[PDB]
Symmetry: C3
């Protein structure tokens, strides 16, 4: 059987709120290594890459390999019933037609046992190889969420330019245009981070803000976010689920 | 004349927010004992039983008996104008065509004097006799509100089963089904209560979650809620207005 | 060129949220004295009078006179992108077709540079002379906002009566009527203010609550609000932008 016990049930709730707005039909690849998820949106522009290691689960147990076709919108409704401190436990059988969901209160008074039906998926699997990117921008997750939200009111697409000085976001629309230059000033404070970059070569691409707004739904999961981009390759937005795995977001450039 | 002065005006605001979603046409039975209200919904499945003792009012004064046909939705709009710490004073005459509503600020700077027109009611009165119930479940008011809200996403009806071990809530719908078993674990903490029960005999009935969601609108009124149920009799949900009275909610079983 | 630097960028955000609901087509009169704005609504019942002194700007610089026809709704969308502590800098040229908007983070890491297109206005200018009013009521800004909001549920118009004792607000509508008498009780507390008045002669006029609700959008700007009114003259609602200027709101009496 499959049995994964997560003490921090808040993590799984934050994960599912990050996918349901982008995708609603995906497959959960379950193995001894951990949980994996790979799916695209309707228009096949973006891709999700979820990984949850078994080393992070309080109690992991998987006999054979599993591939669970799960409706995310349905699952998100169920995981809305779980509390923040509630210990969430997923439990499938090896011939699983359904998937159980155990929401356990800390003191074990309120024990909830949900049961979600699976479905058959005609899935097309995507194998993305490892690439070395020209630029890797590290920034606060709340910072990137505001930038994408503010430029959404300006235009439909964002021009991201990168150099050695810093990264500049640009948008143009109806009421005009705006520019957000992210630099690395030298001040004196505490842990407020900035925006370190590992530029090998300057890049300048354009991306859709609609899908970037879907990516910022994984904000609560991580304190900071890395955006790795390179000429003629899709941009990767990564939210690292600390001590569990990571949530990558691939996105193709425009035109 | 009728004159009732309530120092804690927040209570009356919490009371009216609990009825307006269930009923909008009810009669206020006023006497020397206190305030009483008894009315059913449109479909005559549920009943409200409000009681406010005169022993709890800062200043109660009733010459003769009164029966005031009051539009609750209209009254709820007016009582939305009262502050939280505002001393609310209700004042009718003995031949009342209208009902006055005095909202007094603590320091007596902001004094508001509202006037609401009454209406004639073709009311059908209901006399419910006292019954001894098979099971009385005591639980936090915020706990019962979450259970009813979470199962609402599952199905339309909830199967409540009771025993000696504990109480189990069940629902089944489109995306699947869920079960919430409330037990009495033995841990070590403080005043976090659990769910004591006085079962004489195990009961199992089914109720509508739509009307139960109307009942949980009386949450702010009480810290805990009692649900007394018995085979072939309507379930009673009671929110005790401390040092004032109680707000009962009768509900007929399904099928 | 025109260059105004405001350290407290929150003020400008609060200003624009107060106009956009009342008016959306106005002209910004820029001179060495400071910023001025004078415009009416569609139905020409109310008038806005914004004044921001150059003595309050961290860095003011205006070569020649300027009159900028600015879409307020467009500008409000842009100023929604500015942070609370962000240092906002407005910068036009002397032949300005557009208007720049510099949003500078304190530590100067996040620097945003927006650009808004101006437009030609067929504006009708209004010269209001200084008048001595019969009554000037001083009250908390949050107090006046609640009074206008509560009477909005009652009726469409508010009857404001003034005397030596205090000021009384009255409204009548469908579910009935209400009265709010503001007096000056003698208690013992701290800085909770009340409602001082400089009545020369008692006044009683009627005004629309729809436009008064548009005026209360300038609440965050000031702690207290002054309402100066006089028989047969329009009522003036003033929100004083401390150490910067003031935001007046003229409103014609009904009938």
């Amino acid at each position: 059987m499959f049995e994964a016990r997560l003490v921090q049930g808040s993590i799984l709730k934050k994960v599912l709120e990050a996918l349901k707005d982008l995708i609603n039909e995906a497959c959960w690849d379950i193995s001894s290594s951990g949980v994996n998820l790979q799916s695209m949106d309707s228009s096949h522009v973006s891709l999700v890459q979820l990984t949850l290691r078994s080393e992070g689960f309080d109690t992991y147990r998987c006999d054979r390999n599993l591939a669970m076709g799960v409706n995310l919108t349905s699952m998100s409704k169920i995981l809305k019933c779980a509390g923040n401190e509630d210990i969430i436990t997923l439990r499938a059988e090896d011939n699983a037609d359904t998937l159980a969901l155990v929401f356990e209160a800390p003191n074990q008074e309120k024990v909830s046992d949900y049961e979600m039906k699976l479905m058959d998926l005609d899935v097309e699997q995507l194998g993305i190889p490892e690439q070395e990117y020209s630029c890797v921008v590290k920034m606060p997750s709340g910072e990137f969420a505001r930038i994408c939200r503010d430029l959404s009111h300006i235009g439909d697409a964002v021009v991201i330019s990168c150099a050695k000085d810093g990264v500049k976001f640009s948008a143009s629309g109806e009421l005009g245009n705006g520019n957000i230059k992210l630099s690395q000033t030298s001040n004196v404070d505490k842990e407020e981070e900035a925006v370190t970059i590992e530029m090998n070569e300057p890049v300048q691409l354009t991306f859709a803000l609609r899908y970037l707004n879907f990516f910022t739904k994984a904000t609560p999961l991580s304190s900071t976010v890395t955006l790795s981009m390179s000429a003629d390759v899709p941009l990767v937005v990564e939210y690292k689920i600390a001590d569990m795995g990571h949530l990558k977001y691939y996105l193709a450039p425009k035109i």
